[PDB]
Structure 1
Amino acid sequence: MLGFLSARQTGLEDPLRLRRAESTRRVLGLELNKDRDVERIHGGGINTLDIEPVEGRYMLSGGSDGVIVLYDLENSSRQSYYTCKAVCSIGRDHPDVHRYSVETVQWYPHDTGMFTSSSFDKTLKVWDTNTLQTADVFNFEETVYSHHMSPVSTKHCLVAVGTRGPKVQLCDLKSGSCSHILQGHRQEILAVSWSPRYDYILATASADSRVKLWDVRRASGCLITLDQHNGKKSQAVESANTAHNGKVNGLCFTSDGLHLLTVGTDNRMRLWNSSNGENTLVNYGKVCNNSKKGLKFTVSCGCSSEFVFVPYGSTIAVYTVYSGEQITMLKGHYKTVDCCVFQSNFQELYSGSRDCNILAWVPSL
């Protein structure tokens, strides 16, 4: 590493080299945090986490008990040991608390003054973070499994919602229009994710073992349907062209948005060319998941090699996205891990699981 510092000082290597190499080294040295703790307030398992995209300071967490906790991740104390204190809380005494489990919570991109939370109580609530009051509510005829706002859209502000209905809802936060729907799936839509690269590209994964990419501006259904075999087993499109041999319960675009990682209940993760949905045949081995709802997993950013952190039983499996090589198992949870969210500023990880714990993984040394 002194070689890295010397090369940076002497201009031999771009500082990009040291930055991404050290980010990768930090991610590889991920371990149970020696001096850090997260305050425990959820009475039930944490189903979702979200660190705000700008300044990466505050973290939302939705629990199976319906409460939403807002934590400050910064060590505002002077000690090396600190607990991520809870700033705010939609608790059981809040007038607008979710009646059932909160399954997805997401900070509004471009601004930390608002966030959103969808629950199995058939509601997508939009909260003002300052007053901590519901600015809006969208009701659905069937329970919400996931939702996502575009991390890129300066123009549109649509929330793509996947419920147990076979339709992907698009709720306009600009003047409230939840009527827009996308047809083409056949069972519950367990995951939805906007492309970080393209403004109007949305990937939706449903229990019909299919993943569809939509240009929501378009009037002609999905753009691409992901196919495991790319055409080896080709059939007229009524039941073929499946992404997995089970329910596809998780989506994640890579950092650049040029590839898509789909995890399904066939104990398989697959990497897809996001421009034509071709399977890249990256192996990843066996990725154990049996979740009946959406599975939240994230990818690394700002590193020499991209990593993907997938909940794997009661562990976090870290894989290399483009080679599939298994990095490691982060092993500190006592029950199945529901979500993991990656802090890209310091290569940190926060994992929420059914054991009512949010565990922080920090690079060692």
Structure 2
Amino acid sequence: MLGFLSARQTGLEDPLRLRRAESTRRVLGLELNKDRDVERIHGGGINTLDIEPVEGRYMLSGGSDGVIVLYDLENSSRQSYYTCKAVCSIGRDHPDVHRYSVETVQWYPHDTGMFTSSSFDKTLKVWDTNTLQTADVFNFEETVYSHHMSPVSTKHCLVAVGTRGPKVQLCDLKSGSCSHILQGHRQEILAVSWSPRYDYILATASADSRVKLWDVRRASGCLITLDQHNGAVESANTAHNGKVNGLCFTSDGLHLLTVGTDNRMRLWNSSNGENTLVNYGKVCNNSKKGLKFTVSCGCSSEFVFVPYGSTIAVYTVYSGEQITMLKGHYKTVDCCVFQSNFQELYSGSRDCNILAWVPSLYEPVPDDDETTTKSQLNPAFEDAWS
């Protein structure tokens, strides 16, 4: 540390280096609930989490109960230990509440005043955050597994919806259009994800074992089908020997991660679909529904956090190296989300907990001359062989 501080003060190293090094060290030090609980509002499993992109203060949660909960993550108490309290909820008393489990919540990418929700009740809903009233509602023939709004598109406001139907659907919130379908897939579409680099490029994953990249401006059909063997454009390509149930672009958009029920994670070049041949080993993935997982941002290494049964596995994206297993939950983890500002990970599970994983690099320090106001050696940490 003191070396980094000296090098920064003297301009020997760019201020980038201390910042990225310490961010990486913090990710390596994640510990369960060290400073922080999250308030138990849900009665069911936590299907989905989304941290607000503007300030990172607020987290939406959706669950198998159909409830949507909005949490405040900032410690506005003066204590070193605190609870992330629920600001407000769309509970079962609300008229517009979802009838069946809520499978994706996403903030509007450009300000916090609106958010979107989807559910196995075959709806996509648009919510006014200040009032928690729906502004628009879209209905579908089939249960929605996933939806996404483009994180970078200013030009268009399209929601991609993946359903049990074989056709991807696109809803235009500006016009209210929901007629536009993409017709290339053959089974249920389990994950959809817009490129963070390009306004118009949508990745889609399906139980047909295919990941397809689309340019939604075109009348032409899809661009690229990912072939895990690298050899041919559509006739037989598969990304996994199983269902493909999760997508995550890397934070630069240059690669796409995919996870599937073959228990493998695979890294792809997003500009042409080449399998980069990074091998992570067995990544346990039994999930028959979409799996949400996340990369880090702003670290010296790009990490990926992936549900691994009841654990969260951490890998280095490019090296394939398994770094740690975060070992908290009692049932399968369904989502995790990364707070980029402070390198804190939140995780939802079918055990109904939301758990915070927080960098725990060192303890509060005593003064040895104190009587009892020290940083206490609690007797729970003591042996008792007598």
Q: TM-score, normalised by structure 1?
A: 0.98
Structure 1 residue 25, shift from structure 2 partner: 0.7
- CA–CA separation in structure 2 for the residues paired with 1:104 and 1:189: 14
Q: How big is each residue's C-alpha offset from its partner over 1:175-201, in whole Å with a ceiling of 9 and x where there is no partner? A: 101111111100000000000001101
Structure 1 residue 296, shift from structure 2 partner: 0.2
SS of alignment partner, residue 61 of structure 2: strand
Structure 1 residue 239, shift from structure 2 partner: 4.9
Structure 1 residue 240, shift from structure 2 partner: 1.3
SS of alignment partner, residue 130 of structure 1: coil
Q: 2:225 touches 2:234 (CA, 8 Å); kept in 1?
A: no
Q: How big is each residue's C-alpha offset from its partner over 1:140-198, in whole Å with a ceiling of 9 and x where there is no partner? A: 00000000000001111100100000011010010101111111100000000000001
Structure 1 residue 237, shift from structure 2 partner: 5.6
1:82–1:245 distance in 2 versus 1, CA, 3 Å: same
- CA–CA separation in structure 2 for the residues paired with 1:35 and 1:276: 44
- CA–CA separation in structure 1 for the residues paired with 2:276 and 2:118: 33
What percentage of residue pairs aligned between the two structures are identical?
100
- CA–CA separation in structure 2 for the residues paired with 1:181 and 1:25: 45
- CA–CA separation in structure 1 for the residues paired with 2:178 and 2:286: 31
**Deviates further, 237-246 or 274-283:** 237-246
- CA–CA separation in structure 1 for the residues paired with 2:132 and 2:233: 47
- CA–CA separation in structure 2 for the residues paired with 1:224 and 1:100: 34
1:48–1:207 distance in 2 versus 1, CA, 3 Å: same
Q: How big is each residue's C-alpha offset from its partner over 1:289-329, in whole Å with a ceiling of 9 and x where there is no partner? A: 01001000000001111000000000000001111100100
Structure 1 residue 218, shift from structure 2 partner: 1.3
Larger radius of gyration: 2
- CA–CA separation in structure 2 for the residues paired with 1:13 and 1:200: 38
Q: Which residue of 2 aligns with 1:14?
A: 14
Structure 1 residue 33, shift from structure 2 partner: 2.1
Q: How big is each residue's C-alpha offset from its partner over 1:235-258, in whole Å with a ceiling of 9 and x where there is no partner? A: x66651100000000000000000
CA-based RMSD = 0.8
Counterpart of 1:259 (choices 238, 255, 259) is 255
1:238–1:9 distance in 2 versus 1, CA, 3 Å: closer
Q: Which residue of 2 aligns with 1:174?
A: 174
Q: How big is each residue's C-alpha offset from its partner over 1:267-300, in whole Å with a ceiling of 9 and x where there is no partner? A: 0000000000000000011100010010000000
1:6–1:81 distance in 2 versus 1, CA, 3 Å: same
Q: Which residue of 2 aligns with 1:134?
A: 134
1:223–1:237 distance in 2 versus 1, CA, 3 Å: closer
Q: How big is each residue's C-alpha offset from its partner over 1:49-103, in whole Å with a ceiling of 9 and x where there is no partner? A: 0000100000000010000000000001110111000001000000000000000
- CA–CA separation in structure 2 for the residues paired with 1:84 and 1:131: 21
Q: 2:225 touches 2:233 (CA, 8 Å); kept in 1?
A: no
Q: How does 1:1-365 map to 2 (within 5 A)?
A: 1-231=1-231, 239-364=235-360
Q: How big is each residue's C-alpha offset from its partner over 1:5-58, in whole Å with a ceiling of 9 and x where there is no partner? A: 111101000001111111111111111122200000111000000000100000
SS of alignment partner, residue 189 of structure 2: coil
Q: 2:35 touches 2:358 (CA, 8 Å); kept in 1?
A: no
- CA–CA separation in structure 2 for the residues paired with 1:76 and 1:107: 23
- CA–CA separation in structure 2 for the residues paired with 1:161 and 1:59: 22
Q: 2:224 touches 2:233 (CA, 8 Å); kept in 1?
A: no
Runs of 4 or more above 2 Å deviation: 236-239
Q: 2:37 touches 2:83 (CA, 8 Å); kept in 1?
A: yes
- CA–CA separation in structure 2 for the residues paired with 1:318 and 1:239: 35
Q: How big is each residue's C-alpha offset from its partner over 1:312-362, in whole Å with a ceiling of 9 and x where there is no partner? A: 000000001111100100000000000000000000000000011000000
- CA–CA separation in structure 2 for the residues paired with 1:41 and 1:172: 33
- CA–CA separation in structure 2 for the residues paired with 1:274 and 1:238: 16
SS of alignment partner, residue 350 of structure 1: strand
SS of alignment partner, residue 19 of structure 1: helix
Number of residue pairs matched by the alignment: 360
1:140–1:80 distance in 2 versus 1, CA, 3 Å: same
**Deviates further, 62-71 or 239-248:** 239-248
- CA–CA separation in structure 1 for the residues paired with 2:275 and 2:2: 41
- CA–CA separation in structure 2 for the residues paired with 1:145 and 1:197: 24
SS of alignment partner, residue 19 of structure 2: helix
- CA–CA separation in structure 2 for the residues paired with 1:322 and 1:103: 29
- CA–CA separation in structure 2 for the residues paired with 1:244 and 1:27: 29
Structure 2 gap segments, 5+ residues each: 361-386
- CA–CA separation in structure 2 for the residues paired with 1:359 and 1:220: 44
- CA–CA separation in structure 1 for the residues paired with 2:235 and 2:94: 46
